[PDB]
């Protein structure tokens, strides 16, 4: 099967540079014209850059022309996007996009011919610095227990329960962007009330921007 | 050029919905995007449905108008649909502003409200947050009101926009930030969640 997988995303300062990478599997990159699409938070899809099969022609959106450079390594089955002199308006999830038809049929700006999309990589262009989260337990027929992941930056935070073994009844709520510019979220798992004193519930918090991994045991109040 | 689509559209569960896109002389793509996810191609090249996409999704392109038809609308079709095409003037790719599709007629579900008082660890870290978790409700519109004693709370309230759960019911969070002093000084604190005229209340005391 066709798979597109991007990396290179992260927090960067205004005026800074970031190199995005897209690794293609399940097909030969050289047979396809490729493109980059981006999406600002709560905003629509926007075409960024495009490249031909051998990289003879490149194309860029008006707003990124001169700062961004789309390139490809057919030998490595990888598409790149060097993003220089970055601004706050460049903050978006960046997707790698593959046309359904080969280089002879679908060109890089033909945004109506896309059949495969990447997982996306978040680019945060802020003057703010990385902040690790503070994890607090939300103590409990059925009892609702969870853990509060407070004051972190930037997104994301992933919360698993009992090293991912506990999946049923789990709901990790979307984060709240406070007036301070920091995020906070909560993950709640519904468990049997009879098991509370005999069983252990641990939330596994992971904040990749600060390389933070917190395991918090959520036990009943005293 | 640019692509024009209506920001929103609604369809009753099991019925047919037609999403239109307006552009000139193009080869159109239709991309489904769910809130937390990457987009998915439902149609490309006006009518080509990728294998794995249910045949309830069909694409048609008439003179200067693209159309995505969804016959027998299901709960899982509730998503953002973007049209893509080519801008020959500029030489780049173009997208419509998207069409958020709301699949109505799902069973009206009452919200399950769970209120949490500040933890011991958070109070030692000289902080107080009241966590009000609202889950399992349809439609996805709730108005949260916080009460200090018997009085409505004006400041320190942060509420997440309602988002869909795994089971297709909705969910939202409301956080009340206080000083450990403000938490202790009152007898109790209430989370009033209004969903379709009916109010569900939960109370926490120090």
């Amino acid at each position: 099967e066709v798979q597109l997988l991007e990396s290179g995303g992260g927090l960067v300062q205004p005026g800074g540079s970031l190199r995005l990478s897209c690794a293609a599997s399940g097909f030969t990159l050289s047979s396809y014209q490729m493109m980059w699409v981006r999406q600002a938070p709560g905003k629509g899809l926007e075409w960024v850059a495009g490249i031909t099969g051998r990289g003879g022609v490149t194309g860029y959106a008006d707003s990124v022309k001169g700062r961004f450079t789309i390139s490809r390594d057919n030998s490595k089955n990888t598409l790149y996007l060097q993003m220089n002199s970055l601004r706050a308006e460049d903050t978006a999830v960046y997707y790698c996009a593959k046309p359904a038809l080969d280089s002879d049929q679908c060109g890089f700006p033909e945004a109506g011919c896309i059949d495969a999309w990447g997982q996306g990589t978040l680019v945060t262009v802020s003057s703010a610095s990385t902040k690790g989260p503070s994890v607090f337990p939300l103590a409990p027929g059925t009892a609702a227990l969870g853990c509060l992941v407070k004051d972190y930056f930037p997104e994301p935070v992933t919360v698993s329960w009992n090293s991912g073994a506990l999946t049923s009844g789990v709901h990790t709520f979307p984060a709240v962007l406070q007036s301070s510019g920091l995020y906070s979220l909560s993950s709640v798992v519904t468990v049997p009330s009879s098991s509370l004193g005999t069983q252990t519930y641990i939330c596994n918090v992971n904040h990749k921007p600060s390389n933070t991994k917190v395991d918090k045991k959520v036990e009943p109040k005293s | 050029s640019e692509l024009t689509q209506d920001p929103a559209v609604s369809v009753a569960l099991g019925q047919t919905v037609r999403i239109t896109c307006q552009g000139d002389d193009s080869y159109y793509g239709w991309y489904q995007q769910k809130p937390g996810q990457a987009p998915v191609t439902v149609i490309y090249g006006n009518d080509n449905r990728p294998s794995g996409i249910p045949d309830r999704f069909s694409g048609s392109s008439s003179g200067n108008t693209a159309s995505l038809t969804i016959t027998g609308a299901q709960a899982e079709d509730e998503a953002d649909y973007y049209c893509g095409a080519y801008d020959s003037s500029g030489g780049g790719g173009i997208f419509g502003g998207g069409t958020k599709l709301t699949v109505l007629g799902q069973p009206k579900a009452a919200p399950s409200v769970t209120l949490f008082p500040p933890s011991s660890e958070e109070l030692q870290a000289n902080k107080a947050t009241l966590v009000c978790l609202i889950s399992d409700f349809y439609p996805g519109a709730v108005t949260v009101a916080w009460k200090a004693d018997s009085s409505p709370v004006k400041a320190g309230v942060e509420t997440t926009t309602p988002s869909k759960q795994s089971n297709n019911k909705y969910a939202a969070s409301s956080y009340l930030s206080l000083t450990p002093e403000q938490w202790k000084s009152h007898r109790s604190y209430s989370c009033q969640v209004t969903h379709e005229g009916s109010t569900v209340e939960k109370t926490v005391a120090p």
Partner: peptide, 10 residues
């Protein structure tokens, strides 16, 4: 036949 709108010039 579908032909790409852009390619490397010959």
């Amino acid at each position: 036949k579908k032909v790409a709108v852009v390619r490397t010039p010959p």
